[PDB]
């Protein structure tokens, strides 16, 4: 009876490595809840278990509050202090109440609350101790297969889930099968699965390589990037600081044994291992393997790279359904355009001709001088307007007066283009002139400017009939805006 409480507390404390205090607090809450259910009225109840005897006293708790909303469970601070002057806001006032007999009903409630406390203590500490597993490749047994997810048993009452998107496209699991996967997310949800496991994401590939390649687990080789088409093909980029170690050779292993072990665990996924380079162009050449790259052109402003290949290698460089270029682009972070050497030359000739036409049209220069600007690397009016004067003065035949005139023309051309677009739509010119009439929103100003009504004068000249087809403009609203425009233009 008495000594049995101590023996139970000691057995549970030792077996679940849990603080005795946390078990008692929970038993007190369990007994309070079991007591509340025996009364027809909603009462507040505190239970206190004596830590030496295992005896327990049950109260009618009265949550000391400032304002009483529930007179059956709450008492004012003034009324609580009339019974005991030591009480504060948030304390409990008690009332001698018959403790519930410990029947198999309370026993079952106590068992359930202990089990729940162990889930939030023993199992929580087990998950904390398995900080590596929360991130590394956990191993589970398939408990249940549904259409949209697989439930894994990890042992110790821990359940994990693999979602349909987190599976490989050709995997078929049965109840009782062993499955490995990366624990990529732990969610403290009050309902559902708490442990989310992936086999499809790139982290599964990284951690399989960490286990299979000791040199990655010892931090001698680093995986810098991983790009993956799950169950089909992946690319990994590897670097080492030790010049004595070939990082690609280490990840492949003797006759490919290491990469084949990882591929076999991923259902026969093809894995390319590439050397990481700190030069983006050299890294993209490596990422494009097994296709040979002839030349690369880098557009830093668009964050894009044009990759020229021999006409025989084009199909290999793109890969089946663009898989090779897509995985290389995901691995590099660059947008990759794969074309032939002939197509790259034709593209550059078309861009050079478009730049020459743009410069000839807007800068009032001859085609010979526009060609020199493009040969010196200028492709946009913005570059010519904003580039440091020193770079323009390095061009053979440019003097300081001609560079100043060229920049002034480029700025005036950019301003003319801006004004043209601002009057064509409602960016600035029609967003101020046509939008002067009170009531004109930016959308209506652009709808007016699409009809050639660009200014407040153009609107003052319209009839209601000329504007009747504009979506969102009623005849009354059209008439009001035309009259507002006329009042400003003709009577201001």
């Amino acid at each position: 009876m008495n000594k049995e409480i101590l023996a139970v507390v000691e057995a549970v404390s030792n077996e679940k490595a849990l603080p005795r205090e946390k078990i008692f607090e929970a038993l007190e809450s369990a007994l309070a809840t079991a007591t509340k259910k025996k009364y027809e009225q909603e009462i507040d109840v505190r239970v206190q278990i004596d830590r030496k005897s295992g005896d327990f006293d049950t109260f009618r708790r009265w949550l000391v509050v400032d304002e009483v909303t529930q007179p059956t469970k709450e008492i004012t601070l003034e009324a609580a202090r009339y019974e005991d002057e030591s009480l504060n806001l948030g304390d409990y006032v008690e009332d001698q109440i018959e403790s519930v007999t410990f029947d198999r009903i309370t026993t079952q409630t106590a068992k359930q609350v202990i089990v729940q406390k162990v889930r939030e203590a023993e199992r929580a500490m087990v998950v904390d101790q398995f900080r590596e597993h929360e991130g590394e490749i956990i191993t589970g047994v398939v408990k249940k297969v549904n259409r949209d997810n697989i439930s894994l048993d990890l042992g110790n009452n821990a359940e994990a889930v693999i979602l349909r998107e987190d599976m490989l496209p050709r995997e078929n699991f049965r109840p009782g099968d062993r499955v490995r996967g990366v624990l990529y997310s732990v969610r403290p949800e009050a309902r559902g699965a708490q442990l989310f496991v992936t086999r499809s994401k790139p982290e599964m590939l990284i951690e399989l390589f960490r286990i299979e390649v000791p040199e990655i687990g010892e931090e001698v080789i680093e995986i810098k990037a991983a790009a993956r088409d799950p169950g089909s093909r992946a690319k990994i980029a590897v670097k080492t600081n030790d010049k004595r170690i070939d990082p690609v050779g280490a990840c492949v292993g003797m006759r490919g044994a290491r990469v084949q072990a990882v591929s076999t665990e991923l259902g026969g996924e093809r894995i390319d291992i590439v050397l990481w380079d700190d030069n983006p162009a050299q890294f993209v050449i490596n990422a494009m393997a097994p296709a040979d790259v002839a030349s690369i052109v880098v557009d830093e402003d668009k964050h894009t790279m044009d990759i020229a290949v021999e006409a025989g290698n084009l199909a290999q460089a793109i890969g089946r359904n663009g898989q090779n270029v897509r995985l290389a682009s995901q691995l590099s972070g660059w947008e990759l355009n794969v074309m032939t050497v002939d197509d790259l030359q034709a593209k550059h000739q078309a861009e050079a001709h478009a730049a020459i036409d743009t410069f000839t049209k807007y800068l009032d220069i001859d085609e010979d001088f526009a060609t020199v600007l493009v040969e010196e690397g200028f492709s946009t009016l913005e570059e010519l307007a904003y580039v440091p004067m020193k770079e323009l003065l390095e061009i053979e035949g440019l003097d300081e007066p001609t560079v100043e005139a060229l920049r002034e023309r480029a700025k005036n051309a950019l301003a003319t283009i801006a004004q043209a677009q601002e009057e064509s739509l409602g960016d600035n010119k029609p967003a101020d002139d046509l939008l002067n009439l009170e009531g004109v929103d930016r959308d209506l100003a652009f709808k007016l400017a699409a009809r050639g009504v660009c200014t407040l004068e153009d609107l003052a000249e319209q009839g209601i009939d000329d504007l009747a087809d504009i979506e969102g403009l009623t005849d009354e609203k059209a008439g009001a805006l035309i009259m507002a425009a006329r009042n400003i233009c003709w009577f201001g």
């Binding site: 005897s53 403790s99 410990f102």
Partner: protein, 446 residues
Amino acid sequence: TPEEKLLRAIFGEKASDVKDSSLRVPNGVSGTVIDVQVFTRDGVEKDKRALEIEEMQLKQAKKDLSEELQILEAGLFSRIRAVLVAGGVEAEKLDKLPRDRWLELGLTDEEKQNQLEQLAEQYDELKHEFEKKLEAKRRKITQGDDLAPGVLKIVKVYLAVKRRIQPGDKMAGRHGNKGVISKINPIEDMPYDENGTPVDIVLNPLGVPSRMNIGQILETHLGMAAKGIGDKINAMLKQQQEVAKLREFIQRAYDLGADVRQKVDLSTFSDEEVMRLAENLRKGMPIATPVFDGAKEAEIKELLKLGDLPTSGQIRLYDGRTGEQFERPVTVGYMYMLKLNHLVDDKMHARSTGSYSLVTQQPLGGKAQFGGQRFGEMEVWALEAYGAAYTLQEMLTVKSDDVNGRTKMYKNIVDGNHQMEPGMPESFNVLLKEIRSLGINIELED
């Protein structure tokens, strides 16, 4: 359990082992508790309600014997007043003194002082008899009662159900016309006549020529004659008519026949009994018809002619549903019908899964024991006579006898899988043990 054994510590008592359970009673009947008896074997402590019943019956018997003494003393004093009307009467002096001394008044040695002495003998006998009988009645209430071997107290409770009528009860007349009442119609659907009154009960005519009880139709016609006389009395009395017209009509309704035995006359009833006799005749006039010397047809016709009813006994009747007339006018009247105590909420019974017998694992028999109906031998023959084979297999293996078979069946029914695992009847194993308990060696081969 750990917590059930910890009961001593957390709360108290001891340990939760013996099943705490209060004898609660079953269902099927309503009622109102009208009378509770409590009998106590002597020596056992009377609780507070047994002392309440003891005080109650002490109080009732005390009041009853005291009222015996008071009522018989009132009759005795009325006798003393009746004797002292003559012979030394005191008209004013009689009620000046207390009433228990009505003997020493002025009166000589006659039969009257002798009678007052005899009444004094009776009065003192009643006094001492009341003393000794109240002592004996307190003894009878206070004592215990000899009872069964090893019983403390018997509580008897009298429920008082009020059972009305419903489709399924059995009613019958007095000639053999039985019947289960089949539908309790509304008022409007009843066939009414060209006065307005609905008929109460619609029998079936076809039971008359085969089941030859033609007496119920003569009883029906004579009952309609009786109610016709009763309606004419109710009409002559509801109009507040003087007693002369009531005397006329009641005399005409009581003569009415051949040489008969009755021969009453209302000229010696004196104008107050005739009103009370008509107060008793207004719901109908009772008619005696002795067994083999009864009322012939012409007398029924002459009594149906005294009321203004049709001679043939048949009124044309309208319909309640259609509101249009039934062709070929029908027979109405009054029949005296009896409710029999073969009710329908005493026969109706149903059982899914109840208790099972002990020696042969089959369900119990009866209704008070919550039992199942006997699927007898001729029903087994009638299912062999069809081709029903699985119905008979579950009718005598799964539903009845095999215990593992029926627990598998109950799990399979509450999970939606209609399927039986057959097994063997356990009563066939009882047959094997009874034949095997002789010198006979019965087995099961293979």
